[model samples]
Target: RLDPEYWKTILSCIYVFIVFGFTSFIMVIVHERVPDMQTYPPLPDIFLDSVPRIPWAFAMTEVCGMILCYIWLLVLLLHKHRSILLRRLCSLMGTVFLLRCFTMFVTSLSVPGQHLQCTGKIYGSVWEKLHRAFAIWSGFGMTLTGVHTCGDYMFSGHTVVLTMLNFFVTEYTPRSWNFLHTLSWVLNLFGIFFILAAHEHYSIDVFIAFYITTRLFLYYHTLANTRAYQQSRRARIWFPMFSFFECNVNGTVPNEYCWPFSKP
Candidate 1:
């Protein structure tokens, strides 16, 4: 009696979480407990600033985003909406992001060479390859989604301009969604410039560097928009842990909401 699509959905969820959980557990164990057996090599002085600061605040945000998204994927599968395509897209997007968060966690743990007397030779062997691989997957996966949503050519150039335009033009709910969209754009822009200016190494630099070139500011804006949309309506039903849910959606549904708060 089980639908074929239902089984596929279930399998996808299992695969996504298994990959994330296993990878994260391995990385955490290797980094925190056995710092002696770390994967990535230490960076040289030239690329030292390229090393990221994995703040506790940033870590918490990623954790919240990943957990909420996993729950959202489960809801989509269970609901079995009329649009199977929407469900597939949502699952695919959510799974990619989950994997990305796990990868980022692993990559962020590498301490600078000066601090650890690391000379890239030791850290480079393991960290470099894993970082490149995961970076490619995360960047390409996100790019694929953007191309699918906004058309390939349009997003390939003037991405920020497009995102800013979309912010005012496209309708969203809860009013605060607009602000989040703008903030994501600023971060994406800053992340892009920071990567390019800091690191010239093709492997480490290209993903974040070109992301700015290829994506509109709104690419991340859309991501933040997802949080907004979630707050607007169905998120409360599924995401009971969200205190902001009531503050955003109130008694009304999101899809029907208008854009008086939206500014040019």
Candidate 2:
């Protein structure tokens, strides 16, 4: 049999590259095609006037949130239950990307005017050279930075990142480490607040992103953990593709328990 560790490493690499490509493609498409669309009487928000511009805070939180989340992912790969953890991560992130694509296509709202003022010229021409080009130069794809695009406003992408990271942290954290869990929660909340404070997103976008992402996270995990879901024929065939390391159900119960190998 192939070493489980080797399979995990290979699968993780593939997952990362696929997700990066998926996000980069979506961003490019949104920037090139989506127009500056807005809702009527745009959701009222006091932050536009009251909150002082803190561009650095917004940028810092976005970067820190991603770093923390990746750190947790590294921990998972190094620790026990890695197969299960990576499988769930793949499902969760894939779902989040799909939801984001749908939301971007359906809403297409303009960036908050306050955000535009703070950033000064958010979007640039299609051919504008990438500013933070070095960051992902070696990766599967590149992310354009420095210039913000419009029409990706219905649900805050930053919110999705922060919320999902928080969710993963809280889910995998030891029950004894209540403080760590709380800290993760607080950090995500502050991340969202910084996004709002900078007027990077309207109030509704942030709020809805949290609700929807959280709901999806809960629903997915619930189904994944359920015995019935794991034993289903569909899951038996599909889980191994993403998970690679093991099957969700085990035993020699014929159709009900389908993994060919003995349990580790």
Candidate 3:
């Protein structure tokens, strides 16, 4: 029988993209209209003052983090956890990104670097602004597409991605692959510091992203494993996504591996 999970993951993917779109749209708007570092300078900081900015290091480390995590995802997929892993990732990222929209809308932090160039006056009207937003969102915030935005720095989006990738990679892999997990952890930690070194985000932003992402991930998995409390409550009124995604899952997912091409 074909598992319905495959179709469900497709829906989750669609939903996550919508959440991500809203996040990127807000980022681009804040870049154009919000007060920048010039108008509101970054706070005097111990870490920022000591190290020199190595701008490219931020993107470099994040790209590496993505690679390592995706590699682990392949292992998970081969291990026959395709739906669970994909759905869990979608749920976590969608929630964090939705939260980021709230944080961004409520408060805009000053740009983190003085020497860094922020995008300025890109559009003449709302229509042009919409087009630029589409560009930044589609470019996925990569300068490779000639999009360098100095968006809200209150919470670092890059840290959320880098940290969550490592967490997921580590949590799902087998103990036999402990070394790989450890390396991912080191890489994840390094990338967070690199964001500071590049002067890309406030320490608070990085801190919030790392802490919130990890805690939320931990909370989701922990809650999923314990059904005693949820049976009476359906796990919580707010987390229908969590309850639905995890309905078929039971216990901690064991370390199991299978070759994707080996089976029919």
Candidate 4:
């Protein structure tokens, strides 16, 4: 049987999963049911036309890369603190997914005409097709997995994934692995370029995604370590729901892993 601390972490992970799962489900249902008939260009015409379209295969690899990075980080975190790491990672993911759902809801801007034409057919094998179909049915994206989904722009989902993964690499990597951290940053920028080159998203969409994701990531961790936030009665009540932050502040985990501003 698991100890009390283990149970807390397990419950926190479950909560994070449930919240994210539900939000994504709702987001997908809304995206499909509501058709985007309007078009808006948030970027200049010259910039939009300058980027050439590459094969969908290249853009798709970035998608897989993001997932692989997340899994790699999750494994490392689990090794460090088991369920506690899961709770922290899940909380971060859950928050990002929730925000994504909200942003997608508020913005239904149409894809640029040029982008629509530039996005050619996406060719994939049977397994790829099957996987995408499952993803679509499960409300992961605007279309089936193998197919390219359009008009879900306003903010780029691919940018969010790349940026978030890069943030994780920076936060989790040791100071000695500065080279790896720099490499992750370069990879993220390239991934964004790949999406743009493939005509998967508008320049504005990518810009806003990076902006919003960076702000949210920074804010969430700041709140996690803030003494004022942690000391509140309400914080205590909701602490168990997302306790990884509290664990860090309370020295439940190693001091090195804790935020720099955490209270003594």
Candidate 1: minimum summed lDDT over ten consecutive residues — where? 147-156
Global Cα lDDT for candidate 3: 0.73
Candidate 3 local Cα displacement, residue 141, angstroms? 1.7
Candidate 4 lDDT, tens digit per residue, 1-264?
A: 222266656766777767656654544444454343335454464545885666663545456565547655654643444454555666666676666667777766545553343243242344554453455445545333433454454666667767777786577555687886767777777777776676556667778788888987786666565644456655443333454445444433331343233364
* Better structure of 1 and 3 per TM-score: 3
RMSD, one per candidate, in order: 15.8, 7.5, 2.7, 8.1
- Candidate 2: worst 10 consecutive residues by lDDT? 249-258
Q: Where's the lowest-lDDT run of ten residues in candidate 4?
A: 251-260
Q: How much is the lDDT of residue 177 in candidate 1?
A: 60
TM-score for each predicted model, relative to the true structure: 0.31, 0.68, 0.88, 0.68
**CA-lDDT, candidates in order:** 0.36, 0.59, 0.73, 0.58
Which sequence of candidate numbers ranks them by lDDT, best first? 3, 2, 4, 1
Per-residue lDDT tens digits for candidate 3, residues 1-264, read: 224378778888998999888887787677665444565566888887788878587677657666876776676677766677888889888999888888987877765455345545656678887787787787766544566654444777778888888887887776677788878877887878887887777767888888899888887777867753447865354653766676666666666677778557
Best by TM-score: 3
Q: Which parts of model 1 are misplaced by more than 4 Å?
A: 1-4, 25-42, 45-109, 113-180, 187-264
